Design an enzyme around this catalytic site. Structure first.
Site, short mmCIF file in Angstrom:
data_model
loop_
_atom_site.label_atom_id
_atom_site.label_comp_id
_atom_site.label_asym_id
_atom_site.label_seq_id
_atom_site.Cartn_x
_atom_site.Cartn_y
_atom_site.Cartn_z
N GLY A 17 -10.19 71.69 -0.54
CA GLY A 17 -9.98 70.88 0.65
C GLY A 17 -11.13 69.95 0.99
O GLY A 17 -11.43 69.01 0.25
N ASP A 118 -21.76 79.64 -11.01
CA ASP A 118 -21.54 78.19 -10.99
C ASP A 118 -22.72 77.44 -10.40
O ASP A 118 -22.58 76.50 -9.57
CB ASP A 118 -20.24 77.87 -10.23
CG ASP A 118 -19.73 76.45 -10.50
OD1 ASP A 118 -20.06 75.86 -11.57
OD2 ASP A 118 -19.00 75.94 -9.60
#
Ligand SMILES: NC(=O)c1nnc(N[C@H]2CCCNC2)c2cc(-c3ccc(Cl)cc3)sc12
Length: 259
Positions: A17, A118
């Site tokens: 989003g 990550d």
């Protein structure tokens, strides 16, 4: 009225989003709001465990239908990615300070048995005083629980930052993977470019590094001292790769620097 917030500006956008800036109507306190349309349950669970000065703090969450809202510590300095000048990097003393802070946050995570999975400049934010904060725990997982380590097998992350064993092995230890990505972040900070598309046998730039062709970019741009640390971090065999306790003993890591 102290529980009322105004959404004043769009800060970023995840694969889920957007991130918006919220300001408290009464106190004027600012908080980042992550909006995910609509994995998230786990991200919330891990976030609740986090309490460290170099990790984005989690304040809470709210679900209003199929849209999930995450309330996080606002980092007004934005992404570390945006402090890296293409083909240049940044001044060595700044890179070293960010690296020290990144190590502090990673040591903290590993100490509580969490691996980020990550690490990259887009997921390292800066507060108003340029203190680094590890962010974006959507790929994070538990690798140690009740003092027992669990090997990982899921292939995840971002190719230029992933360690070679992820691509080649069925199972692998979590910690060396996060050490490797930190080394790629350090390379980016000092050279303003990523060394390879991925650390695969078929990637020429990765072969060049394994062949010690440090007269080529990005290596050529990096001073011998930090380059010596990168030689210890970007080691193919994760069992031979430097660990954080040894990174803390590295010469460049301990070199006094200033602009
Ligand atoms: N927790 C926060 O604060 C926060 N969290 N996530 C952000 N972006 C995500 C996007 C997906 C990749 N990972 C980073 C983000 C961008 C910020 C910013 C701050 C100032 C300015 Cl001027 C612009 C952006 S603050 C912020």
């Amino acid at each position: 009225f102290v529980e009322d917030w105004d959404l004043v500006q769009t800060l970023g956008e995840g694969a889920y989003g957007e991130v918006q800036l919220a300001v408290n109507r009464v106190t004027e306190e600012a908080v980042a709001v992550k909006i995910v349309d609509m994995n998230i349950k786990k991200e919330i669970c891990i976030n609740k465990m986090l309490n460290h000065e170099n990790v984005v703090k989690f304040y809470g969450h709210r679900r209003e239908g199929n849209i999930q809202y995450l309330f996080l510590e606002y980092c007004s300095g934005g992404e570390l990615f945006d402090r890296i000048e293409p083909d240049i990097g940044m001044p060595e003393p700044d890179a070293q300070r960010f690296f020290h802070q990144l190590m502090a946050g990673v040591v903290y995570l590993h100490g509580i048995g969490i691996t980020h999975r990550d690490i990259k400049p887009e997921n390292l934010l800066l507060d108003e005083r340029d203190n680094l904060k590890i962010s974006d725990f959507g790929l994070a997982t538990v690798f140690r629980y009740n003092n027992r380590e669990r090997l990982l097998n899921k292939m995840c992350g971002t190719l230029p930052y992933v360690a070679p064993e992820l691509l080649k092995r069925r199972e692998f230890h979590a910690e060396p993977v996060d050490v490797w990505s930190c080394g790629i972040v350090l390379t980016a900070m000092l050279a303003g470019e990523l060394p390879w598309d991925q650390p695969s046998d078929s990637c020429q730039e990765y072969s060049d590094w394994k062949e010690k062709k440090t007269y080529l970019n990005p290596w050529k741009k990096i001073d011998s001292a930090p380059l010596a640390l990168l030689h210890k971090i970007l080691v193919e065999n994760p069992s031979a790769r430097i660990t954080i306790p040894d990174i803390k003993k590295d010469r460049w890591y301990n070199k006094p620097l200033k602009k």
